[PDB]
Amino acid sequence: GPVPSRARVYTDVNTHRPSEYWDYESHVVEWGNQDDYQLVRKLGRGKYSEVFEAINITNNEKVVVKILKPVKKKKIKREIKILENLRGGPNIITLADIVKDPVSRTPALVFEHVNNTLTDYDIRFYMYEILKALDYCHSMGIMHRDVKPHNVMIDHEHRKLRLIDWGLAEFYHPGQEYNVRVASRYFKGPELLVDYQMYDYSLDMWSLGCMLASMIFRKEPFFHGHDNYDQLVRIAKVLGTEDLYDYIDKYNIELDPRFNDILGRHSRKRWERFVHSENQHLVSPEALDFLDKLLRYDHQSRLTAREAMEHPYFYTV
């Protein structure tokens, strides 16, 4: 079978905490009355959720209400426990309340309102704001597992950032085998794509690297896969096939036969080739060195959030 792996940072943070912290299945959720919130308008719709702008009638404050389609109760307990553990943390969305409408009885989460609205400095600034949230949640023993631009809200007028949608987040336990059907296709780490289950917080750093590459190069998404197998091929077209085989061999990973006719052979490309007239004002040696240190096949060889915060790319923030 596959070779075991563990996180280089915050490895045992949950092991040293009582089970009440991480045993979300045993968490008792107490649903308040949704009558204290008046729904104003529909903001958007997700896979098993509808998001509304609302007003808290007790204090006249605008909030956001996420009405969840309860397809999996254990998953709702997980998201609430994680939101409660992280409540008030730097750049983490604030869970304000947990309520149910008296008639429908549909689970609803109430969040702080974010008025969601670039230069080389703006990218360094906001990348540092995301790192504050990631180093915090990793220190809290939590992997987000769905880092992407849609899950990052920015109020640019107030230079405020929030990391949202904790629905795929999980608690990190060393040696635990996790479900690889996480994150969104363009941001899926190589470990998920090859079915390597013993992954960690480093999955989030790969996704952050995909975001940085798209911003500095103005190429959205950076790795444009059309399916999960193809997604690995798009990565291999940049990182090369030699280092992919070194990765699978290091961890004794069995490659799925679906990769046989599509993977091919690819050279490792240099980051400088993605620089063009339209993006050169956002690119620098420091930006490329930092990106190269995030986008690595081997999950263990990527910068941790703490390490990334010490990179020369952030000397100006």
Task: Write out the residues near a copy of itself by the rule CB under 8 A.
Answer: 13, 17-18, 20-21, 29-33, 35, 84-85, 87-91, 100, 102-103, 105, 136, 139-141
Annotated binding residue at 50? yes
- Which partner in ligand AT8, a copy of itself, none is near 314 (CB below 5 to 8 A by kind)? none
**Among 9-17, 27-35, 76-84, 152-160, which window interacts with ligand AT8 (CB under 6 A)?**
152-160
Cβ proximity of 54 and 37 under 8 Å: yes
Annotated binding residue at 19? no
The span from the CA of 71 to the CA of 144, in Å, is 20
146 is catalytic: yes
Candidates 57, 118, 262, 317; binder of ligand AT8 (CB under 6 A) is 118
The span from the CA of 50 to the CA of 45, in Å, is 4
- Which partner in a copy of itself, ligand AT8, none is near 149 (CB below 5 to 8 A by kind)? ligand AT8
Residue 28 or 71 with smaller CB distance to a copy of itself: 28
Summary count for the chain: helices (H), strands (E): 9, 10
Residue 31 or 48 with smaller CB distance to a copy of itself: 31
Annotated binding residue at 66? yes
Residue 63 or 253 with smaller CB distance to ligand AT8: 63
Q: Which of 84, 44, 37, 85 is nearest to 63 (CA)?
A: 37
**Beta bridge mates, 41:** 53
DSSP H or E stretch at residue 153: strand 152-155
Annotated binding residue at 225? no
Annotated binding residue at 209? no
**Beta bridge mates, 112:** 63
Residue 212 binding ligand AT8, by CB under 6 A: yes
Residue 24 binding ligand AT8, by CB under 6 A: no
* Minimum distance of a copy of itself from residue 99's CB (angstroms): 10
* Minimum distance of a copy of itself from residue 97's CB (angstroms): 12
Pairing of strands 32-33, 95-100: parallel
Tell me the DSSP string of 18-67.
Answer: -HHHH-GGG-----EEGGGEEEEEEEEE-SSEEEEEEEETTTTEEEEEEE
Residue 122 binding ligand AT8, by CB under 6 A: yes
The span from the CA of 114 to the CA of 94, in Å, is 10
> How far is CA 308 from each of CA 135, 278, 314, rounded to the nearest angstrom?
10, 26, 9
Residue 283 binding ligand AT8, by CB under 6 A: no
Total binding residues toward ligand AT8, as defined by CB under 6 A: 18
DSSP H or E stretch at residue 248: helix 241-250
DSSP H or E stretch at residue 250: helix 241-250
* Minimum distance of a copy of itself from residue 133's CB (angstroms): 10
Annotated binding residue at 74? no
What secondary structure letter does DSSP report for 106? -
* Minimum distance of ligand AT8 from residue 207's CB (angstroms): 10
The span from the CA of 304 to the CA of 57, in Å, is 43
- Which partner in ligand AT8, a copy of itself, none is near 105 (CB below 5 to 8 A by kind)? a copy of itself
* Minimum distance of ligand AT8 from residue 33's CB (angstroms): 22
Spot the catalytic one: 135, 146, 200, 230: 146
Interface contacts to ligand AT8, rule CB under 6 A: 43-44, 51, 116, 118, 122-123, 126-127, 130, 149-150, 152-154, 211-212, 215
Which residues are tagged catalytic? Answer: 146
